[PDB]
Each structure stands twice: as structure tokens, then as C-alpha cells.
A paper describes a structure:
The Fo motor spans the membrane and converts the potential energy from the pmf into mechanical rotation of the central rotor that, in turn, drives conformational changes in the catalytic F1 motor subunits to generate ATP from ADP and inorganic phosphate (Pi). Here we have used cryo-Electron Microscopy (cryo-EM) on detergent-solubilized cysteine free E. coli ATP synthase13 to probe its structure and understand its rotational dynamics and coupling.
Sub-state 1A was in one rotational sub-state (here termed Sub-state 1’), whereas Sub-states 1B-E were rotated by a single c subunit relative to Sub-state 1’ (here termed Sub-state 1”). The maps presented here were generated from material imaged in the presence of 10 mM MgADP and all showed the enzyme in the “autoinhibited” state, with the C-terminal domain of the ε subunit (εCTD) in the “up” inhibited position interacting with the F1 catalytic subunits. In the cryo-EM maps of the intact F1Fo enzyme in the presence of 10 mM MgADP, all α subunits contained ATP and Mg2+, whereas the contents of the β subunits varied: β1 bound ADP, Mg2+ and Pi, β2 bound only ADP, and β3 bound ADP and Mg2+.
Numbering used by the authors:
A (entry chain H): 3 to 69
B (entry chain N), C (entry chain O), D (entry chain S), E (entry chain P), G (entry chain I), H (entry chain M), ...: 3 to 79
F (entry chain R): 3 to 78
L (entry chain X), M (entry chain Y): 1 to 52
N (entry chain a): 4 to 269
The structure:
Amino acid sequence: TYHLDVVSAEQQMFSGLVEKIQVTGSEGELGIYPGHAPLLTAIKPGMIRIVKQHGHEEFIYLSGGIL
Amino acid sequence: NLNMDLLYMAAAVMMGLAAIGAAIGIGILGGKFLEGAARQPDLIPLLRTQFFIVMGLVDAIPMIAVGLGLYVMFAVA
Amino acid sequence: NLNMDLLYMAAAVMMGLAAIGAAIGIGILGGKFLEGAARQPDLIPLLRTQFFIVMGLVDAIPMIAVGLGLYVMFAVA
Amino acid sequence: NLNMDLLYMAAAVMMGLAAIGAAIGIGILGGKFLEGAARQPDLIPLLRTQFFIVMGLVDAIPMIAVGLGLYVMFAVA
Amino acid sequence: NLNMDLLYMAAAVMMGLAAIGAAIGIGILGGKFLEGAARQPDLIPLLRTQFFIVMGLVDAIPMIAVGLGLYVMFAVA
Amino acid sequence: NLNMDLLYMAAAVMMGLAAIGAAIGIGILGGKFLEGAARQPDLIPLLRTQFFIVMGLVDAIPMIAVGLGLYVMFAV
Amino acid sequence: NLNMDLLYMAAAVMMGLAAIGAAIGIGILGGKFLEGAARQPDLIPLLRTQFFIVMGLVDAIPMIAVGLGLYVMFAVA
Amino acid sequence: NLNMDLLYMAAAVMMGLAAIGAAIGIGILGGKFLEGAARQPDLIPLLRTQFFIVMGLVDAIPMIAVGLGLYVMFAVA
Amino acid sequence: NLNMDLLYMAAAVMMGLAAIGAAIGIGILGGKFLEGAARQPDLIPLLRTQFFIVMGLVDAIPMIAVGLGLYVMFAVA
Amino acid sequence: NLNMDLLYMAAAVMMGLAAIGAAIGIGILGGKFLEGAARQPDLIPLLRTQFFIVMGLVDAIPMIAVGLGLYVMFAVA
Amino acid sequence: NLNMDLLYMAAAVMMGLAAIGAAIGIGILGGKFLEGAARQPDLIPLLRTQFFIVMGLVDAIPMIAVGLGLYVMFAVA
Amino acid sequence: MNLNATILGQAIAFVLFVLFAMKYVWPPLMAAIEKRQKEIADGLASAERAHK
Amino acid sequence: MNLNATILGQAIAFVLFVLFAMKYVWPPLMAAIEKRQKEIADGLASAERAHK
Amino acid sequence: ENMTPQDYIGHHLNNLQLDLRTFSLVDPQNPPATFWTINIDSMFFSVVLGLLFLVLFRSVAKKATSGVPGKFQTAIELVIGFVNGSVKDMYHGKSKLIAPLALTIFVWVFLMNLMDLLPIDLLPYIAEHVLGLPALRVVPSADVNVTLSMALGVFILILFYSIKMKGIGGFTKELTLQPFNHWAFIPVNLILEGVSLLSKPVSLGLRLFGNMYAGELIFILIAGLLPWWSQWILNVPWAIFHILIITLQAFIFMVLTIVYLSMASE
């Protein structure tokens, strides 16, 4: 698993270990697995899919941002 | 005799080149399509439509050529 | 006479090469069309406009080619 | 032994060119399949079905070329 | 006897090759035209002027091949 | 006499074209595979499996061309 | 007789291959030129300058091949 | 007699084409593997393993053609 | 008198392939050069110098094969 | 006598194909190596050391064709 | 005597193929060289160093071929 | 051109030119350099203890 | 044909080749050697400063 | 001297071979048939260049010191630098032999090739018109048998090191299962893997050989086909270039040796 930090300019929105996420990158929808090669992209407003280790899913709404 | 002889060769060039071209063109096309689909699974059908429409333009000349090959192999044989 | 099989092949060369050329050119152009479409799907009718409008230019020479190959294979031969 | 010799060059041409066409045209496509995989692993089943559905086009003309190769080789011989 | 029958073949060489060249030289340029245009659609009318200015040099030399092929094809053969 | 070297030449051309095709195809597909792996190194197994699945469809026609080239070269 | 009437096959090979070279090279150069223009849609005239600079280098050797093709067709033949 | 000429020609072409095939097929693959290392040298000893597991396949056809060329030299002459 | 036609055909191949090589090398190189120019137009007078200093090194061999075809045609007849 | 005219030709063609294959493959491999160099200095020695793992493998088949071509041209004829 | 022609024709093919192979292998590499130069313009000399190191490999087989072509054209004859 | 029995004689010469370097050239050459490698490596630890 | 003229030709060739080597190739050889010697020598010098 | 240019050229295409049964000298006009006819010109140059490399090195090796090196010693240690720098990262096992293997390959191959820059006709003159020897040529690598012997030595070593460091029990598994791993393919698998092994020493030999055979050829033609006042103007560029190949081929041979063995053993 890997560690995910979702942070706004104001306050922190998530922190915990993750098995995978699925994020709507500006160029295309993308998915990140442990050890993914360094990458940097904008992202579009929309949901983001987390699976907290032990597979427990959740969804978060974002106004955009950078991954 | 020779009228009986070069109607296989004559179709060889046509059908081989056509089979190359009609495969290369749409390999290119469908590759761009398939990545465009991986990047936007919202738009699989919308882009599938365009994939077919655009394919319709490539295989024209290949189909004419390969049909004339079939012609030379079975109609005039 | 021996030329009958020579007219067939002299047409077949130009036919196969026209097939290759048209297929590859239109495949490339369509591939860029399909990729561009994924970014701004609001634009696809304008993109498709441009696509047809230049694809009419992709094939002019192959449309000399197949025509003048048939000018042999169905008139002069 | 004269009259049939050309059938064995003509049987090779149409086979080999279909081989080149099919292999290169499906490779250029499998590459984009693999990218669409690596950007989204959990889409891999849908992209595999799409890959098969697309490749059903690419292989079309090559299958005809190789079929008529089989014909000329063994039936005509 | 060897006057016209191989002049067909030679003109076919000239014009099939020029067809390959003139199909692909339009294809690549058009691909970069489309994909660039898809990003900057508001500039299209300028881009297409540049397109035509470039194609004017692209196809000028194949035009020689095909017109010369006709000068052979109809007059000399 | 004048004939048989034609058969041998034809089998050589068969294998040559099939090698060109089945080498270029596998090379392209392999380059995309290696870079996909370098992107998500921990899906090497899944990608390698599906890479085999897609490769299988590439080799068919060239391998048949080798089959018939060997038949022409030795069975006739 | 063929001792002149085959000269046209030589001219065909030469100048058609030259047509391929000039067409593909000019097209590629123009495609990168168009992309640059679309990405710097005010810098254009300087890019057009440089495009014309490096353009003729693509036709530096194709033009000698054209010269010698017309040599074989209208000085020799 | 000239059967030696054309049998050596058979070996010649058999090896000649497979050489281009197996050279370019590795050029492509290494070309991608190198950039994969370039972004991140700490993955080099992994990618340089999967590289071999891939390149192993690229030679399966051409290193058949190689041995059969050598045979057509020293057994068939 | 067959000699004095193949002496020209050798020049046809020898000086067509050279034109293709020159065109392709210069076209690819110029395309990448123009992209470099467009991404930084302040920098052009350095890149262009490097461009020529490379381009001569591509065209070295085209311009020797051209020369040997010229010899074979004009001197050897 | 007829054996010369084609025992030299076989080697000529065989080594020409050996030239094309290696030239193209090494062109692309070195192109990606220079991509690495320009993107990531401070690695240049590491990239060089790996690159020469591959460069030898690219020559693997073609150099056999060049050796056998010299054999054909000087031991066979 | 006839024998002069086929030797010239054999050498011509070697030199044309060498021309194309070398020219492409250098143009690709130089393209990546220049697009790198446009990123690291201060470090041009280091790129030049490694560029020429590799260009020492690009040219191997093509100039082997030019040498053998010269030998065939002027001492086998 | 021609195969030749030179192909063995050259192996006989090769393995001997190998032996004459293996046990008698490289160990001396690199050891005399390892002495120096240490002797410039030690200066840092010397000044390090001097600093401590 | 006269064998002698090749002698004058290769004389000119080798002379100018050697000019190229000396003026462009010996300097980098000696300069990399002098660079390595500078590194060795100042290494030992600073090592001895450290042992002082 | 009735040598036509086509004919003069031939004498450099000709080796000075022995015949071991007769210890006699095989004349150029008739070539005897047998496998027992040593190539003296390649052998004498081989041994003389090898020994005058070993002499330069071993003279200092007995004497090497950790003071500032002698300039000649500085160059010895700098080529040791390139060699050890390559060995140092591509090899990871214990073996002693790898390093001097690669070194004796690199410098010795470079010397065998180094001769080509020697004016092509010069030394054959002291062969023929002084010591009474019918023909000669002065680049060992342009004589196939040395490259064949060396690369098949590396072949022996590939077998030897690989079997030493993983045994037959795994060597058979590798040689038979790969690449498809599924038990029905094994017979067809081994065919493809076998000559895949052998092409490595073969390609090592041939890549080097051809480069120097064709290297000499251009100088032969420079001598034969052109007037005095033009043989120099092609030769300036051709030396400028052939420097590069004669260096690169030795570097390639070294690195390829080490890499080929490393892949099998490590």
C-alpha cells in the first residue's frame, strides 16, 4: 500500500494508507498503484476513488487540484 | 498458355499490397481510437461511431484492389 | 499475343500502390482526428468537417491511379 | 517442367505480404492497448474486449489473402 | 512490339510511386494540421492557409511525376 | 535444371517477409510493454500476461508462412 | 526498339523514387512546421522563413534526380 | 550451372530480410527501454531483465531464417 | 546493345535511392530543428548553426552515390 | 560466364539489406540515448554503459549477413 | 563483352542501400540531438561528444557497403 | 576468405597471453594502486580524529 | 601500371595524417594524463598537509 | 611490371600462408587444398603486438609505486582506469580472471587493428623485395581465423562459467523451457535457444572481422585507382574516420565479452 494525502489550502482532507485510487487527470482518467512512477498532472473537478487498505472504499468531491 | 500463367502473379501484387495497406491504416486508426477510449471511458460509444465512420474511408481503395484481384482469380480467372 | 498479361500487371502495379498510399494516408489523418476528438468532444462536428475537407485532398492522386488502371483493365485490355 | 513454376512464387508473395500486414498492423494496435492498460488497470477487461472487437477489422483482408494463398498452393498447385 | 506494352508498365511505376508519395505527404501534414487545430480551433483559418502554403511545395514534385506519366501514357503509348 | 531454384527462392522470400513482419510487430508491442511496465512496475505480472494474450494474435500468420515455407522447401 | 524504349523504365525508377523522397521529407518538415506555428501563433513569419531555408535542402538531391530523369527522357531518348 | 547462383540467392534473401527484421525489432524495444531507464535509473536492473524476457521472442523467426540460410549455403550450395 | 540500357538502369536505382536518403534525413532533422526553434525562438541562431553542421554529415553518402551514378552515365555511357 | 554476374549480385543485395537494418536500428537506439542525455545529464555514463548492452545485440544478425556476404564475394566468387 | 553490365548493377544496389540506411540512421539521431540541444543549450559540446561517438556506429555497415560497391565497380570489373 | 588451422594456433597464443597478464601483471598493477587509494583515503580519517 | 606513384601519394597522406594526429590528438592525450597527475599529486600533497 | 590495377589489387587480397606438411610456402597463383596451411602474416603480427604490449606493461608492473606515477605509468594506470571502470560495474562476482581477460582482449585487439594506419604498401615492400616473400598484408584482424579463435574462446568460456555458476540442473531448464515455459513447447524451444547461444561468439568474431577487412580494402583502392595528387585527399578523411572504428570495435569486443558472460553467470 501507499500513503495518500489530500490537502487543501485551508485544511487537510485525508491521510491514510491506500491500496489504489482512481483519479480523473486532465489529460485522461488515470489509476495509481503502489510504486507508480513519479507523475505530475492537473485534475478536473469531480470525484476521486479511494480504497483504504483492507479494501474499504470511499469517494471524495474535489474542485480540481494537482496530483 | 501464358494467358493461363500470369493471372496469379498479376493478382499477387494487388492483393498483397491491399492486405498490407488495409491492415496498417486501421491499425494506426484503431490504436489512436483505443487510447482515446482508455482516456475517456465516458466516450466509448461516441468514439466508436467515429472509428467506424473514418474506417469507411480507408478500406475503399483496398477493397477495390482486392475485389479486382478476386475478379482476376475467379471471374476472368 | 503475349501482351495481354503485361497489360494486367502494368495496371496491377499502379493499383496496389494506390491502395497502399491511400490507406496509409487516410489512416494517419483519421487517427489524429480520433485523438483530437477525445479532448474536446464538443468540437467533433467541426473536427469532422475539417477531416472530410482535407481527406478530399488525401486521395486525389490515388483517384487518378485506380481510374487509369481500370482504363486499361476494363477498356484497353 | 514449365507451366506451373510461377504458382510457387505467386503462392509466396500473397502469403508473406499478408503476414507483414497483419503482424505490423496488430502490433501498432497492441501498443495502444498496453498503454490503455497501464493508465487504468481496472479497465483492462473492457479494453481487452475493445481490442478484440477492433482487431476483428485489421485481420479481415489478411485472412482473405492467406486463404487465396492456400487455394493457389494446394488446390491449384 | 516492345514499344507500348512496357510503356504501360513504366508509366505505372512512375504514377504509382507518385501516388504513394502524394498520399503520405498529404497524410502526415494533415495529421499535424488536425491535432494542432484541435487545440487552437479559434485560429483555424490561419492554420489552413499555412497548410495550403506547405502542400504547394509538398505535391509540386509528384505533380511532375503524374503529368509526365500522362505525357507518356497517352502520347507515347 | 531451370526450375527448382525457383521453389527455393520462393521459400526464402516467404520466410524473409514473415520474419520482417513478426519482428517489427513484436518489437513495437514490446517497446510499449516495457514502458507500460516502467510506468506501473507492480503490474508487471498482469501486463506480461495480457501482453502474451495480445502477442498470440500477432504471430499466427507469420508462423503459418513459416509452415508453408518449410513445406515448399522440403515437401516439394 | 527496346534499346531506347526501355530507357523509360530507367527514368521511371529514378524520378518516381525521387518523387517519394521529396514528398515524404517535405511533408514531415511541414508537419513539424504547422505544429510549431499552432504553438506560437504570432511567431509565424520567422518560422516560415526558416521552413523555406531548410525546405530546399530536402529537394537539393531530388532535383538532380529530376534533371537526370528528364535527361534520359528528352536528351537521350 | 546457374542453380548454384539461384540457390545462393535463396540463402541471400532469406538472411537479408531477417537481418533487417531482427535489427529494427530490437532497435525499437531498446529505444523504449532506454527512456524508461532515463527517467529513473533505480529501475534499470528490473527493466533490463524484462528487456531480455521480451527480446527473447523477437529472434524466434529470424534465427530460424539464419540457420536455414547457413544450411542452404553448406548443404544445398 | 543491351549493355547501354542497363548502364542507365544502374544509374536509375543508384540515384533514386540517394535522393530518398537525402530527403528523409533532411526532413526528419529539419522537423525536429523547427520544433526546437518554436519552443525557444530566442535561440534560433545557435540551433541553426548546429543544424547545418549536422546536415552535411547526413548528406555525405547521398552525394557520393550521386557522383558514381553520374560517372557511370556521362563517362561510361 | 553467367556465374559471376549473379554470384556478386547475391552478396551485393545481402550486404545492402544488412546495411539498412543496422543503420536504422542503431539510429533509433542512439536517438533515444541522446534523449536521455539531454533530459538527464549526471547519468550519461550509466546510460552509455546500458546502451552498449543493447547496441551489440542490434548488430547481432546483420553482421552475420555481412560476413557471409564477404565470403560469397571472395571465396565463392 | 556483356559481363560489365551486371557487375555495375550489383554495385549500384549496394551503394543506394548504403545511402538510404546511413542517411536515415544519421537523420533520426541528429533530430534527437537537436531537440535535446534546444533544452540544454549550454551543454551542447557534451551532446556533440556522445553524438559523434554513436555516429561512429551508425556508419559502419553503410561504408562497408560503399567500399565493396567501389571495389566491385572498379576491380571486380 | 579461407578457413585455416591458424584457428587453433591463435587460441594457443591467446590463452598464453592471458596467463602472462593474469597472475603476473594485474594483481601487481592494481595492488600498487590500492596502496595509494588507501594512502589518500586515510588523510580524511586522520584529520577527522585530529578534529575530534 | 607504375607502382611508384602510390608511394608519393601515401607519403603525402601519412604526413598530413600525422599533422592531424599531433596537432589535435596528442594534446588531449597529454592533457588527460596531466589532469590525472594533478589529481594524484594534489591528493598526496593535501594528505601530507593532513598528516602535518 | 605487368600488374594491371585489378591485378595489383589482388596481391593485397592474398595471404602469405604456410603448409605444415611441407613447411613450404603456398604460392599465390595456386592455392593448395587442405586445412593445414597456417597464415604466417597474421601470426607473426599477432605475437609481436601481444608481446610488445605485455613488455610495456610488465616492465612497470614489477616496479609500480604509490608515489606520483611516471607518465608512462600514468597512461598504464589510466587505461587500467577505463578497464577497471567497466569491470567494476558490469561484473559482480568473485572471479579473478574476468579483469585481465577483458584487458588482454581490449589492448591486444586494438593493436592488431592499430596496424592498419600503416601505409598500406610500405611493409609488403620489405616483405617481397627484401626478404624474398611472395605476398603479405599487415592487419591480423582482417584474417578471419584470429577473430574466430578468440570469439570461440569466449564461447568455451560462456559454457564454462555458466555451468560452473549454476550447474547443468538449471542450465537444462533454462535451455529447454524458455521462452514460453509450457511443457509442450520444449522441443521447439531448445532449437530457438541453441543457435541463440552460438550467435554470440559468431557475431563477436564477424562484427570485428568485417570492419577491418573492409578497412584495409579502402586503402588498397586508394593506392590502386587514383593518381598521386588525389590519393592523399581521400586518405585524409578516411584516416580521420578509421580512427573511430578501430577504437570502437575493441571497446565493443571488451564490453560485449563481459556482458555476455555476466548474463549467464550472475
